[PDB]
Amino acid sequence: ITGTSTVGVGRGVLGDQKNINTTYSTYYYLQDNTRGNGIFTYDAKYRTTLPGSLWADADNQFFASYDAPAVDAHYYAGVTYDYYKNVHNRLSYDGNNAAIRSSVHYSQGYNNAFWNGSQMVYGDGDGQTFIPLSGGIDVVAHELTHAVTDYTAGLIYQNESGAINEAISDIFGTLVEFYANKNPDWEIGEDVYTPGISGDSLRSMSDPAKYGDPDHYSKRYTGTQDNGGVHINSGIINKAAYLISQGGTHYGVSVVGIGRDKLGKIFYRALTQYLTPTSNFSQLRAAAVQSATDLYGSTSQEVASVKQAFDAVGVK
Ligand SMILES: [Ca+2]
Ligand SMILES: [Ca+2]
Ligand SMILES: [Ca+2]
Ligand SMILES: [Ca+2]
Ligand SMILES: [Zn+2]
To answer: Which ligand has an atom closest to residue 203 CA?
Structure first.
């Protein structure tokens, strides 16, 4: 909407206060004009018709319980935008500052979040498996990263290409979490998963097997559930990424860690220059090796570590 840029204040899902960029025209709207062609947050009002209505507030204060998922979807989309622009010189998900749209309060008791081809969508959870999912910065960045993938490599959402798609979202979700630097870890969704259970998460990148996800190609799922295991087999690539960054010895194979920033550079280059809609795990290895070669040189530690990591997870 046309109006003037304003700064509201509110509390997120976890009870933390933050400032948000809003737009004033009669009401204060969750419309951040400071980033690209805007970040827009909508109320789906417990229904499934999208996007719903652009979030309107009378006083620019967002402290109601109902406001919390909107505050976080809006704010964490901003952090994710900043990560891609500042770290990778990428302007929004399409590289041309496309407007970023999110809807919260999607459906009832909805234990998921997704990119629908055009926008991000967040359930409130059922209060048992999840609380409102936009409360996780890794979750918000995971979702926006699906848009980045769709505009770039275009990895088909099934089987190996789909597991790569998933891992890319977990990897960048985690890198954005580290970028914001509030309780960062290599776990996925810990801030919004199972409020009655401390210390767990939806997935682990450091040890995918702790939740039954494979950490080696020999343990891959080849059935038809979950689009051929896209949220399961992602563990194999998540583990490789974790090893590249942090190092470790895994199934007897030692990997020299090169750190998060270089992991991000290598995978961003792979995603945007080398991967295609049908890339499989072996092709991802080749793309990562080539990306590291471009960035650091063929004789570099970075290239050697990429090879080590894929060796460790059984991907040749
Ligand atoms: Ca208000
Ligand atoms: Ca965390
Ligand atoms: Ca996390
Ligand atoms: Ca929990
Ligand atoms: Zn996903």
So the answer is: 3
